[PDB]
Nucleic acid binder design. Structure first.
Ligand SMILES: Cn1cnc(N)c2ncnc1-2
Length: 231
DNA sequence: CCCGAAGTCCG
DNA sequence: CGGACTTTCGGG
């Protein structure tokens, strides 16, 4: 079965505007885990727009198919395009898509893809269906996969006043001993972000609970100005 | 335009 | 460790 024509068209159009000179530092930035075509985000978005203008966005029945086919292509720009495309089908995504989103998190995994999947798409789903959190988060925490663990930490990143504090701190407590950089940093990030909403609770937490030095330092990067640094 | 959010380099 | 800096991106 041939590649979906929309994907084939995107592949052709991206490839015609590839930039090998730019591709080398872009690939190095991601620790050479991926090939790159060398197309940065402003141009990449315009080339996608070009293809939508000519071909129109595929019927929703092909949504998951399109995403998978782009996910399977070697160059990283195709996963970036896939996430742009998924945003265009946002109003069709619901709680039944959690396993589909899971599979995206654990394939071609790195911080760029996982950070674009988790606080937005998964975050919105669990905000609407908080009863489903306990069907997934304990498995993610227990998994060997650091990107599922990072997802458990970051899905609440944008919740602000809707943050489930008890849940957040329980998750962090489960992962605080991790020696993985991307876990320590994710803990630091979610705490720093939540501190913008509730600085007192974050300050109390970091002063009275074990964290990696990296996590604590990232957590209080801003609020240490409000509380001061004791001699 | 502005600010806030991985990577290298060096002490 | 972790500060000083890098370029890119999201969002205002
Ligand atoms: C991706 N990226 C680029 N530049 C910075 N200064 C950053 N801080 C966090 N993430 C960053």
């Amino acid at each position: 079965v041939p590649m979906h024509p929309f994907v084939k068209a995107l592949q052709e159009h991206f490839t015609a505007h590839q930039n090998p000179e730019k591709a080398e530092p872009m690939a190095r930035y991601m620790k050479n885990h991926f090939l790159f075509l060398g197309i940065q985000t402003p141009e990449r978005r315009q080339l996608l727009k070009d293809i939508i203008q000519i071909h129109t966005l595929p019927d929703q029945k092909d949504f998951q198919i399109i995403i998978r086919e782009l996910w399977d292509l070697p160059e990283r720009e195709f996963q970036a395009a896939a996430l742009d495309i998924m945003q265009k089908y946002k109003k069709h995504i619901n709680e039944t898509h959690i396993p589909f989103l899971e599979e995206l998190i654990v394939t071609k995994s790195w911080w760029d893809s996982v950070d674009s999947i988790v606080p937005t798409f998964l975050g919105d789903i669990f905000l609407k269906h908080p009863e489903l959190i306990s069907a997934y988060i304990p498995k993610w925490i227990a998994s060997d996969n650091i990107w599922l663990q990072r997802a458990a930490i970051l899905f609440q990143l944008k919740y602000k006043q809707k943050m489930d504090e008890e849940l957040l701190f329980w998750i962090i407590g489960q992962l605080h001993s991790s020696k993985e950089f991307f876990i320590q940093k994710a803990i630091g990030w979610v705490l720093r972000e939540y501190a913008k909403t509730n600085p007192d609770v974050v300050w109390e937490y970091v002063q009275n609970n074990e964290l990696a030095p990296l996590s604590k330092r990232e957590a209080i990067k801003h609020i240490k100005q409000n509380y001061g640094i004791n001699n």
